[PDB]
Structures are given as structure tokens and as C-alpha cells.
């Protein structure tokens, strides 16, 4: 399978709005978990949301959410009530749940608030 697509490459959105990304796959794997990543100024990576959702998993904020589109290949990484703090670079990635796990991550898309 091919790496996913994180669009749009640049999303400029006014403060306190609904900013929504799109993580699209050409072909899906049988078992996989999709992750939403954000790069911190410390050159770190933070996992904000994950599909499928695990309500018991700590650290998840109610603002950032991932939504599976009806076609099952495309996803919606939306944030509600966007803050100027949210300005940064984002990316999506999938990890297969097969024995030999393969990492397939998108390119980076910047968010501006």
C-alpha cells in the first residue's frame, strides 16, 4: 500500500473556527490504526487522535477528532474552536497491525490561525 495523502498542504483558518484536514488512502490494509500527528517546536511528534477511537486511552482532547468518511478510505482530521496555539505542521500516519508492522505516513501540511 501507498502512503496516505494529507490535504490541503496549507490551510489558513481564522481563530475559533472548524479546520478540517483530509487523510486519503488509495488502498487500505486489513488491520491498521490511523494516527494524527503534530510537530512541536522541540522537533517532537505528538499523537492527537487515532482511528479507531479508544475512549479509555488517555491524553485525547475533545477538540481534535478523526472521522471515517463513507468510502472508508478517506478520513477527516478536524479541529473545532481553533486557537492561535494550534498554528503548526500536521501529518497523518497509518500503522498496520500485522506481525511485521509497516509505517505509512503522509507529508506535512501547515495550519495557520
Amino acid at each position, epitope marked *: 500500500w501507498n502512503p496516505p495523502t494529507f490535504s490541503p498542504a496549507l490551510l489558513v483558518v481564522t481563530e475559533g473556527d472548524n479546520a478540517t484536514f483530509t487523510c486519503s488512502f488509495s488502498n487500505t490494509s486489513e488491520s491498521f*490504526v490511523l*494516527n494524527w500527528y503534530r510537530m512541536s517546536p522541540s522537533n*517532537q*511528534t505528538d*499523537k492527537l487522535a487515532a482511528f479507531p477511537e479508544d475512549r479509555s*486511552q*488517555p491524553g485525547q482532547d475533545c477538540r481534535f477528532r478523526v472521522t471515517q468518511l463513507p468510502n472508508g478510505r478517506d478520513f477527516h482530521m478536524s479541529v473545532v474552536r481553533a486557537r492561535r496555539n494550534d498554528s503548526g505542521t500536521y501529518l497523518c500516519g497509518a500503522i498496520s*497491525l500485522a*506481525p511485521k*508492522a509497516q509505517i505509512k505516513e503522509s507529508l506535512r501540511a501547515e495550519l495557520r490561525v
Partner: antibody
Amino acid sequence: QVQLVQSGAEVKKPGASVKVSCKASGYTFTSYWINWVRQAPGQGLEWMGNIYPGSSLTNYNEKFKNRVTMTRDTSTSTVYMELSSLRSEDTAVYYCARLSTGTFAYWGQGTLVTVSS
Amino acid sequence: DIVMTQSPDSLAVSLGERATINCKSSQSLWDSGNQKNFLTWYQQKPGQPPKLLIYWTSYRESGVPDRFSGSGSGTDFTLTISSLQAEDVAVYYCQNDYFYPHTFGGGTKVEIKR
């Protein structure tokens, strides 16, 4: 919630063998790697092995050449760890953990195995 | 076999300053198939199961605070706490997550200097 409950503490004699259970719940049990890590009193952690419940693939540590044995039971969603030819040095708390790379890490509460005459 | 050496063995930092722990591996932990450095950092308080802090050298697990930050590439790696709080006193282990066996480092005790 995701939970890993391990079997209770056990005391064994030198030369015996212990079998520690680890019951997974709250996720697709057969799809995630389950690790075994032990910690002797006053010493760091030591990786012991891997098991993939989907096909019972195992990755043992070379330190326990033929002493360690990992198995699974899909009907009860439990993984078992067996260590034979026990020594006093094998006295430790043994942990099971769901550690599939890139996914969230969960841990059992631990199991104390005392090896002493 | 991968050998993980952690230096210093023990570290004393005042409350609120920066702590740095080093971890050197005998072989490279780089994976060309995933473009990642497979190194994990763990935190363990006495009487508690270990807690995963950083995976893939510089990826933060959900719930890990801001102060924890991983870095390095190849055979040299580093875990840094920018603002050492009281709740950070624990032993920190680096672990080879790349090739089998997934050997641990000796650990580094982090205590509050007073």
C-alpha cells in the same frame, strides 16, 4: 477499557518451573504483540520475549535459551509465560505488556515469583 | 546483539532545571524501510509498572508532558526534561526497539537535588 490482569504471586523451589498468565481485554486480542519484561530486586528491566497471538509467533531472549516458553489461548484471550530450571537469580516481578510499535502501551500489574528453598 | 549503555548512572537536578540522559547503542537503530530510529524511553517509579514516554526516538506518547523530549540518531540518543518536577523522580531506561532482542539499558536514576 484495555486491561491486562496477570496471575497472582507464586513461590517455587529451585529447579521448578512457573507459568504466569496475562488476560487481555478491551481490544482485538489476536492483533497486538504482547511482551514479557522482568525486574529483579535492585536491578533494571530485562526484556524476555515476544508473542503474537494471531499465529503464536515468538521472539525469545537468548539469555533463556530453552527455559522460556510463550503460548496463547484465543478462546480466553490469555497469553502464558513459562520459565523452567528456576534459580534464585530468577526471583523477580514479571510484567506482561501490549507493545505493538506505533500503538499505545498497556501494562499488567505484575507478578512476583519467589524462587527459594 | 544490541548493547545499550546509559550514562550517567545517577543524576541529581534541582527542582525546575534541565535533566539530560544519554543512551549509546552498539549498532545503528535506523530503519530504512520506515525512516525511523527505533529507540524507546521508559519511566518507572518504585513499585509501579514501567511507563512508555518516547518511542521512535522523538515521538511523544499521549499524556506525556511538554518537558519530556527525545533526540538523537544512529547510535547516540538523549532524553531531556526541561523543567524537572517532583513527579519525575524515577529510573529511566532506553530500549532497543529495532532488532531482536529488545535489550534494555542499565537505567539512570533521576533524583531531585536539594
